[PDB]
Amino acid sequence: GEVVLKMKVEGMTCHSCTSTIEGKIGKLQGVQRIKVSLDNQEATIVYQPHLISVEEMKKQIEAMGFPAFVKKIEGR
Numbered sequence: 001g002e003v004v005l006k007m008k009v010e011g012m013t014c015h016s017c018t019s020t021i022e023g024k025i026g027k028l029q030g031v032q033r034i035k036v037s038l039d040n041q042e043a044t045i046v047y048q049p050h051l052i053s054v055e056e057m058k059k060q061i062e063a064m065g066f067p068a069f070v071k072k073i074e075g076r
């Protein structure tokens with residue numbers, strides 16, 4: 001099975017930033033599911049620990065401008 005990463009995000013309080021990241025991340029060869037929230041300012045990224053990595057996720061996310069605190073590995 002895949003692995004869930006939970007990253008707290010700041011500032012992302014609209015559907016645009018979140019959707020944009022959802023698309024961009026969705027594009028990457030190795031992600032399986034993604035759940036970027038805004039309300040509770042937190043981003044779920046669900047990827048396969050082989051194809052892509054935390055750093056790809058964050059580096060690509062942070063690169064947009066949105067700082068993110070990737071620190072939960074609650075896979076199932």
Ligand SMILES: [Cu+]
Binds near residue numbers: 013015018
């Ligand atoms: Cu936004």
